[PDB]
Amino acid sequence: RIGKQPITVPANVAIAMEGQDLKVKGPLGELSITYPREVLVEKQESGFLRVRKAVETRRANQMHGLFRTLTDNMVVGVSKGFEKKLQLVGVGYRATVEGKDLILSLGFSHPVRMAIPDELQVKVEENTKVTVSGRDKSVVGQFAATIRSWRPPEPYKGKGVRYVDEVVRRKEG
RNA sequence: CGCUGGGUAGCCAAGUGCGGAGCGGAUAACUGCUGAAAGCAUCUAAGUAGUAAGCCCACCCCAAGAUGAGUGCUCUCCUA
């Protein structure tokens, strides 16, 4: 299952294990997550962490696999980083950068002046598609959903803000 | 007011001014972000984001008999 899998820690990724807390030190940030009340972690003198249950119960079997893949997202998050590939479908849906902010002409009256945070490096390499880059997957997903929460792709319109190779329902009439 | 014609100050509107503000807080329906119990998944079981004329606060007034009777400033207790 999920919970029995060694944490693949790559090179130049320092593991810091503290009292009820994980402090990872990757080259692209230091993510910090408090341990659950029923999960105690063990290490075998290398780049392989193993979270372990502390009590025979159901909730430790919830946060065992949950906390397992969350620490996987910690180590892979601070080592390589996660990127989302949004795409503005259609004509006039242009997206560009204002230094600290990001502006989205989406067919409204005024283009949306949505502020990117400091932890995410976004890039517009072509005027439609926007690569939201970041360390942690949850912030990339929340801000990518926040940009997505203005114009979802309508089926008859066939034209909105969708991310790459995700199947979208379309209709003929 | 004998019946009429006008009218100051009052009162009144039909007249004249003003109000109904909030990237303030938490939510209901819903859309989600990572995401496990069934190595696939799923808005949730951990955490968390947008958001209702609805709830609360802010808004105007009364208001410590709020007996839980508040707080602050100031005055006065003399003669045998």
Domains of chain A: 1-81 (3.90.930.12), 82-173 (3.90.930.12)
Q: Tell me the C-alpha distance between A164 and A131, whole Å.
A: 10
Nearest nucleotide over every DNA/RNA strand to the A138 CA, judged by C1': B34
Cite residues whose beta carbon is less than 7 Å from strand B: A 1-3, 36, 58-59, 61-66, 69-70, 72-73, 113-114, 137-138, 140-142, 144-146, 148-149, 152
Given in angstroms, what resolution was this structure solved at?
3.3
Q: What is the largest CA-CA distance in chain A?
A: 63
- Nearest partner of A163 among A126, A132, A125, judged by Cα: A132
Q: Tell me the C-alpha distance between A9 and A59, whole Å.
A: 26
- Nearest partner of A164 among A128, A134, A137, judged by Cα: A128
Degrees to nearest 5, angle at CA A89 with A84 and A92? 120
Rounded to the nearest angstrom, the gap between the alpha carbon of residue A42 and the centroid of all alpha carbons in its chain is: 26
Strand order, beta sheet including A120-123: A120-123, A129-134, A82-88, A161-163
Radius of gyration of chain A (CA): 20
- Nearest partner of A18 among A46, A40, A47, judged by Cα: A40
Q: Which distant-in-sequence residues (6+ apart) come within 8 Å of A119 by Cβ?
A: A29, A134, A135, A136, A139
Q: Pseudo-torsion of CA A82, A88, A94, A100, nearest 10°?
A: -20
Question: At what angle are helices A137-148 and A58-79 packed, to 10 degrees?
Answer: 90
Question: Judging by DSSP bridges, how do beta strands A101-105 and A112-115 pair with one another?
Answer: antiparallel
Task: Read off the amino acid at residue A108.
Answer: F
CA A19, A25, A30, A36 torsion-angle sign = negative
Residue A26 DSSP code: B
CB burial class (10 A; 0-12, 13-18, 19+) of residue A61?
Answer: middle
Q: Which nucleotides of B are covered by protein (CB under 7 A)?
A: 23, 31-40, 45-50
Contact criterion met (CB below 8 Å) for A158 and A100: no
